[PDB]
Structure formats: C-alpha cells, structure tokens
Amino acid sequence: EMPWEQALAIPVLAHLSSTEQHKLTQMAARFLQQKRLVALQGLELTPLHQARIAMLFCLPVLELGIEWLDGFHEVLIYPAPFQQGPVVLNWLDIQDSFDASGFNLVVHEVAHKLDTRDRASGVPLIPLREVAGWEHDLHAAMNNIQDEIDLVGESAASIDAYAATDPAECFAVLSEYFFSAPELFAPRFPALWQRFCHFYRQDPLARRRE
C-alpha cells in the first residue's frame, strides 16, 4: 500500500481541499500505473517519495486531465543537478519542490510539456483568438522582469534573466510561482494571472482562503 495520506502532508499541497486531495491521489495512482519513475546512479526512492513525485506531476493537470501528460512515458531521476522525450529531474531539486517557496522543478518541467503539446513558445493550448492577448501579457510580464533586473540586479530580483528573455522559460517559471508562491504572481501580473487561472482551471490563491 502506497502511503498516500502521508504523501499529501507537504507544504506545496497543504491548501488542497479534501475533494482535491482525493482527486489528486487517484490521478497520482493512475500516473504510477502508466508511467515509470526511473531512479538513476544508485538513487533509491521510497514509496513515499514516489507517491509525492506522482502527485507533483499531477498537480498542474488536476483539472486538465492526466492525458495532458501523454507527451512522455517515463521520468528519469538523477541524484543531483548536472518531444515524446522522458522528463528529467533530480532528487535534490525534487525535495525542494515539496516546499511552498516558489521553486518547483516538477511543475517547471510539466509546464514545458504543456507548452510543447507545437513549438516551446510560452503559450500552451489555448483558443486561437486568445493567443495574441496571451503573448501580449506574457511579453509585458517579461519586460517587467527585465526592468526589475536592470534596476536591482539579478541576485535581488525575483526571477532569473533567462525568464525575462525566453517566453517558454517565463511560462515555466510563472507556473512554478502559480502553484508554489502565487503571492509572487497574482498581485504583480493581474492580467496574466487571470489567464493562467483560466488555462489551469485552478485558483491557488482562492484555495488559501478556503
């Protein structure tokens, strides 16, 4: 028996409703039926680690569906940092991804898969008529991040200068914020935040209230 109840007890998942926890648990169990977590270079992942990884994968698609993760069959997990291709992660960053700090490698990688589900362009599958307005708000968010970096420096800035430059990277980083530290996102980028709420069919800030 996978320790699903104990798996849920991590900060990034702490604000899910009881129905959301049940729904996430089931999707994660389905994930582990359909996909392999391949721990490399002697890394050993316990059932609790595996359950938590599966849940992190499923969080961004909780309301979209597990089929949104059909662009990969396996996840490769190295102990540490260095198309239909496997998602590559490392255990050091995954452990950080359990916190509600704004960093989440799993969500980052999922965002990239949602983006390219198509070229990696910072635009996931949205209506054709919304693409211009999405790109407008994304690129404004990017310029806003560059202005910050120009003013206070890379270290003091929230986001790395790569997210200010590559729209795909921006999408992926803001997705990390969306799920892990929405207070860094909602008040700063209200228009883009609204589009992400509509795309992901989740409101992580409303969640904290309830």
CB of 17 to Cl ion, least distance (A): 13
CA dist list (Å): 127 to 94, 120, 132, 166: 32, 17, 10, 22
Query: Which residues would be at the binding site for Cl ion (CB under 5 A)?
Result: 100
Angle of CA points 57, 105, 28, to nearest 5° = 15
CB of 176 to Cl ion, least distance (A): 11
In residues, how long is the chain?
210
Please indicate if the annotation marks 44 as binding a ligand.
no
Q: What is the rounded (10 degree) CA torsion for 141, 205, 61, 104?
A: 70
CB of 39 to Cl ion, least distance (A): 27
**CB of 129 or CB of 209, closer to Cl ion:** 209
**CB of 100 or CB of 105, closer to Cl ion:** 100
CB of 106 to Cl ion, least distance (A): 14
- Rounded Cα distance, 143 and 122, in Å: 14
- Could you give the angle at which helices 105-116 and 167-180 cross, rounded to 10 degrees? 130
Please indicate if the annotation marks 136 as binding a ligand.
no
**CB of 15 or CB of 195, closer to Cl ion:** 15
**CB of 62 or CB of 100, closer to Cl ion:** 100
Please indicate if the annotation marks 15 as binding a ligand.
no
The annotation places the binding site at 108, 112, 169
